[PDB]
């Protein structure tokens, strides 16, 4: 039971405050909770390396597929948008970063704002009319966003607002989870309020020596429907697992083809019966490399060398493994480590399904 | 072989001389200035 003791708490508006109550009620006629609210999820992991937990966190942050709202080329109608201040760049930057919880990539919206008044009129996100796709039985974004504002006698017409899929690493608009907590529960901590310890991190063991295996990770999701929170968060967690497994399985297709000359795997036979394996994979991050290094190191305690160098200006991860075995034995150990990673994340899948009811 | 393709050698069969080279040689032997040579070799202009 690797993953236990998860707790989920939404972020809700306190209507006991008179100022917030009056402002919301006179702006949006809002008297109860919004359709989509942020959710903070705190998770406890036991008997698992911090490499795996941090990789799961990274994937949930900016390596999981996610949906945003984007404007197709030519959507911003210059013929009708007479406003001089709401430029295409500003408005599309506003639209891209609205957190959405979409069901399909078919929905297409439109924003048609006309200002017949003598005062600046604020364009909110409730003015996004769905023009294509099946009719929504539940909103996919909050209606309280401020898309823009129009000067008197101006207009803003935007068509072909569609749902675009991508990973958060390439563009920040696909980021999913925001970090709220990360700690190790199996390492003692100093009281850092004292002036003797305020210059230190707090943990009683140095990171150069410690190997924690009992962690607490808390992440916040920006947009989750109220009546299905446990259905959404669970899905997210499960999604992350598959992604990692998928990426790991890619490396599992490299080691299987070590007999044929493969560009992403290079094998040398060094002196003193030593063998060397270099795995160069493009567009990989520290997640996969760190997981590979940690699990190879666990599998081979007396390994000669292992490193996962991810280079920023080369956009690639190079894993170097030097070990005193033959090529076949090294490949067998690598496959065993990959299988260990796969089974660990399968157990994470099972625990996620078991915990969140 | 006025335009659009190479001149071919009847003696062997491979390419012999591109037409713009012939026109350039004629202009060079015909006291042609650079501007009067740049404008005349405009029907041989490359990719538009």
């Amino acid at each position: 039971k690797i993953f236990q003791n998860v707790e989920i708490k939404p972020f809700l508006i306190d209507f006991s405050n008179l100022f917030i109550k009056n402002a919301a009620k006179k702006l949006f006629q809002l008297e109860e909770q919004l359709p989509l609210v942020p959710v903070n999820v705190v998770m406890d992991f036991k008997g698992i390396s911090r490499a795996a937990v941090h990789g799961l966190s990274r994937v949930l942050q900016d390596e999981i597929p996610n949906y945003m709202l984007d404007i197709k080329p030519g959507g911003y109608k210059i013929e009708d948008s007479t406003d001089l201040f709401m430029t295409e760049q500003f408005i599309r930057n506003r639209i891209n970063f609205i957190p959405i919880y979409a069901k399909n990539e078919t929905l297409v919206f439109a924003l048609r704002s006309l200002n017949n008044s003598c005062e600046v009129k604020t364009i909110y996100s409730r003015d996004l009319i769905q023009v294509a796709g099946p009719k929504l039985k539940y909103p996919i974004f909050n209606p309280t966003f401020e898309i823009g504002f129009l000067q008197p006698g101006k207009s803003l017409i935007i068509e072909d607002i569609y749902i675009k899929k991508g990973i958060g690493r390439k563009h920040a608009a696909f980021n999913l989870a925001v970090k709220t907590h990360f700690s190790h529960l199996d390492i003692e901590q100093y009281p850092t309020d004292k002036k003797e310890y305020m210059a230190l991190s707090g943990y009683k063991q140095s990171s150069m020596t410690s190997d924690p295996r009992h962690h607490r990770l808390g992440l916040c999701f920006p947009a989750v429907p109220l009546p299905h929170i446990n259905q959404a968060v669970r899905t997210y967690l499960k999604n992350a697992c598959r992604i990692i497994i998928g990426r790991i399985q890619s490396i599992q297709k490299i080691y299987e083809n070590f007999e044929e000359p493969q560009p992403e795997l290079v094998l040398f036979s060094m002196d003193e019966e030593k063998t060397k394996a270099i795995i160069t994979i493009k567009d990989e991050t520290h997640t996969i490399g760190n997981l590979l290094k940690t699990y190879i190191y666990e599998m081979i305690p007396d390994i000669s060398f292992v490193g996962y160098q991810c280079v920023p200006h080369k956009q690639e991860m190079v894993l170097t493994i030097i070990h005193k075995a033959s090529q076949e034995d090294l490949i067998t150990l690598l496959e065993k480590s990959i299988q260990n990673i796969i089974q660990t994340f399968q157990i994470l899948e099972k625990n996620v399904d078991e915990l969140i009811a | 072989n006025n335009t659009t393709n190479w001149n071919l050698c009847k003696a062997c069969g491979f390419k012999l001389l591109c037409p713009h080279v012939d026109m350039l040689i004629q202009l060079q032997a015909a006291e042609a200035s650079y501007d009067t040579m740049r404008t005349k070799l405009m029907k041989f202009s490359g990719i538009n």
Partner: protein, 80 residues
Amino acid sequence: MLIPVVCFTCGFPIGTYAAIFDKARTEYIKTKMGGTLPQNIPLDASLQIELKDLITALGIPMRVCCRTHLITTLDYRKYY
């Protein structure tokens, strides 16, 4: 030109509580303003305007970046 939709640092959905945070804040200032011209508010030398509880009631967490960007962001509508 407005309060950002998401926090520039982490990306928390600040914008969905932005507009309300604007308007409500005004009345709070009107409660604490006190016999002073509006444009002289940042020079009163006697004000104690705290917006901690307002942002807390909005549901926004106690993150430094999020509250910083919510409070400090200028609005183009209010200067033009």
